[PDB]
Ligand binder design. Structure first.
Ligand SMILES: CN(C)Cc1cc(O)ccc1Br
Length: 209
């Protein structure tokens, strides 16, 4: 069972601005996704402070970076609070309608695309380097769902029968053919050190055979 939804107009517009605007500093995507994972890890740590059993689905709070050269995917895994189905449909838990409005007004007033995270829609920077994005997520109060979009004005949501995650969120970036540099160990490591060096969670860069 696969449901297909239209993006709100303002979100589709933000997505095509990100895809079409000439802008060379594409590496900020990794900082924005990592920062979103860190925010979701803060959220489940804070709930665990008064209710320990919110960690029965995973005591470990971490972020993993997993490049796969055969599939041409970069996967960002976190064991944060995760997302309910309604969250996924509602622009992946963001206020994307009003953040895009403020983001685009800023762009006309001195801002550049690298400031997208200040307006809450940093996730969509994923499309600076990905032609398709898949978000697997599991929240304590809901089942495991798969969100998927290749832009073009729509996204799908389905129940994910893949590997149980326990709790957290997985962003699979199907990279564009000319963005494979973000699969290389030394290039990911440079970006993490440049932009994410004070994230309060361990970031493990997986290696490949
Ligand atoms: C924005 N990237 C990292 C996906 C994501 C992770 C979360 O932990 C929560 C929401 C989203 Br979308």
């Amino acid at each position: 069972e696969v449901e297909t939804f239209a993006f709100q107009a303002e979100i589709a517009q933000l997505m095509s601005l990100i895809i079409n605007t000439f802008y060379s500093n594409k590496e900020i995507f990794l900082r924005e996704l990592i920062s979103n994972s860190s925010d979701a890890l803060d959220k489940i740590r804070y709930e665990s402070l008064t209710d320990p059993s919110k960690l029965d689905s995973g005591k470990e709070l971490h972020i993993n970076l997993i490049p796969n050269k055969q599939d041409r995917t970069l996967t960002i895994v976190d064991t944060g609070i995760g997302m309910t189905k309604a969250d996924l449909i509602n622009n992946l838990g963001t206020i994307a309608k009003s953040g895009t409005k403020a983001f685009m007004e800023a762009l006309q007033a001195g801002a550049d695309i690298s400031m997208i995270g200040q307006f809450g829609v940093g996730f969509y920077s994923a499309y600076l380097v990905a032609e398709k994005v898949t978000v697997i997520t599991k929240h304590n109060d809901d089942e495991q769902y798969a969100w998927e979009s290749s832009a073009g004005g729509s996204f799908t949501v389905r129940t994910d029968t893949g590997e149980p995650m326990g709790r957290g969120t997985k962003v699979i970036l199907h990279l564009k053919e000319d963005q494979t540099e973000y699969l290389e160990e030394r290039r990911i490591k440079e970006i993490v050190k440049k932009h994410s060096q004070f994230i309060g969670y361990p970031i493990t860069l997986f290696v490949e055979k």
